[PDB]
C-alpha cells in the first residue's frame, strides 16, 4: 500500500548511511552549544540583540575567570 | 465600580496578575537578587558600593515594573483595567495575603543585609534608607491603594 | 506587624439617594389581611344565632 509520501531517515540513519573520537568531541561540542543556545531566549532576538547577549555573557565569563 | 465594570472583570482570570501564585513565583525574587550581587562585584568597587547598588536598582526595577503601569499589555474585554497598576490586581484585589507579605517582607530584609557594609558613611546610609521606605513599603501599603496625585 | 494582618478584602462604596429610592420604590407589601379564602368561610358568619 504505497503512497505519495516522502520519507525522511532519522539522523542516526544518516551517519550509518555516511560512516575516531575526534568527531566525538566536535558533536560534544556541538551538544554544549545545543544547550547554551536554547536554554537563553535567542530564537526571539532579531540579531543586534542576540549579538550584544552574546558579547555580555563572553564578557561576564571573561572577567569572572580572570577575577578566579 | 458599576455592575458591567465588575462583571467584565469576574468574568475571566487575569493573565497580568494571576501568574505571581505559581511554581517558582518566590524563589524567582530571591534568584534575580543573587545575581545583582555577582555583577556587581564584577565591576569590582567596594564592597558598600556594590550593595548599594544592588538595593537601590532591584528596588527601582521593582517598583517601575509593579507600580508605574496601568492597564493589561493586551486586550481584556473593553481594557476593564485601565487605570489599575499590576500591584492592585493581585489575588483580585485582596489585600495583607501571603504574597503581598512576601512582597513587603523583601526589601526590608534587604536593606537588614546590606545595612552591615555601608553603616559608616551617612549619607549613603541616608540615601538608602529613604529610597527603601519611599519607593517601597509605603505604595504597598493599604491606604494608598487607588490613591492617584 | 505587617507579618499579622488578617487578609481582608476592600470596603464596598455604600449607596446613595436615588439607589435608595429607587429600591423602596420596588418593595411590594402584601396586604394587611388575607382576603382570598374570605367568602368560602364566612357561613360561620351568617349562621350566628
Given at each position: ?68 | 465600580e458599576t455592575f458591567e465594570d465588575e462583571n467584565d472583570q469576574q468574568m ?65 474585554n473593553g481594557?476593564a ?12 484585589e ?56 | ?11 464596598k462604596r455604600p449607596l446613595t439617594?436615588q439607589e435608595?429610592?429607587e429600591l423602596?420604590?420596588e ?23
Amino acid at each position: 500500500h504505497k503512497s505519495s509520501m516522502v520519507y525522511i531517515p532519522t539522523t542516526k540513519e544518516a551517519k550509518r548511511r555516511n560512516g575516531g573520537i575526534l568527531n566525538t568531541i566536535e558533536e560534544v561540542v556541538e551538544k554544549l552549544y545545543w544547550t547554551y543556545y536554547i536554554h537563553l531566549p535567542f530564537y526571539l532576538m532579531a540579531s543586534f540583540d542576540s549579538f550584544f547577549l552574546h558579547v555580555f555573557f563572553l564578557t561576564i565569563f571573561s572577567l569572572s575567570f580572570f577575577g578566579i | 465600580e458599576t455592575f458591567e465594570d465588575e462583571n467584565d472583570q469576574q468574568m475571566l482570570p487575569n493573565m497580568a496578575a494571576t501568574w505571581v501564585d505559581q511554581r517558582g513565583a518566590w524563589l524567582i525574587h530571591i534568584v534575580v537578587i543573587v545575581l545583582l550581587r555577582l555583577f556587581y562585584s564584577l565591576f569590582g568597587s567596594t564592597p558598600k558600593w556594590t550593595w548599594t547598588l544592588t538595593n537601590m536598582t532591584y528596588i527601582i526595577g521593582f517598583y517601575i515594573m509593579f507600580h508605574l503601569v496601568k492597564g493589561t499589555p493586551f486586550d481584556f474585554n473593553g481594557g476593564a483595567y485601565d487605570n489599575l497598576t499590576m500591584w492592585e490586581q493581585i489575588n483580585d484585589e485582596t489585600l495583607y495575603t501571603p504574597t503581598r507579605k512576601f512582597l513587603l517582607i523583601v526589601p526590608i530584609v534587604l536593606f537588614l543585609i546590606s545595612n552591615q557594609y555601608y553603616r559608616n558613611d551617612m549619607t549613603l546610609f541616608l540615601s538608602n534608607l529613604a529610597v527603601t521606605v519611599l519607593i517601597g513599603v509605603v505604595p504597598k501599603l493599604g491606604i494608598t491603594h487607588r490613591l492617584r496625585i | 506587624i505587617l507579618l499579622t494582618r488578617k487578609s481582608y478584602k476592600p470596603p464596598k462604596r455604600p449607596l446613595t439617594e436615588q439607589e435608595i429610592d429607587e429600591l423602596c420604590d420596588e418593595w411590594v407589601p402584601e396586604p394587611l389581611v388575607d382576603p382570598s379564602a374570605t367568602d368560602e368561610q364566612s357561613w360561620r358568619v351568617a349562621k350566628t344565632p
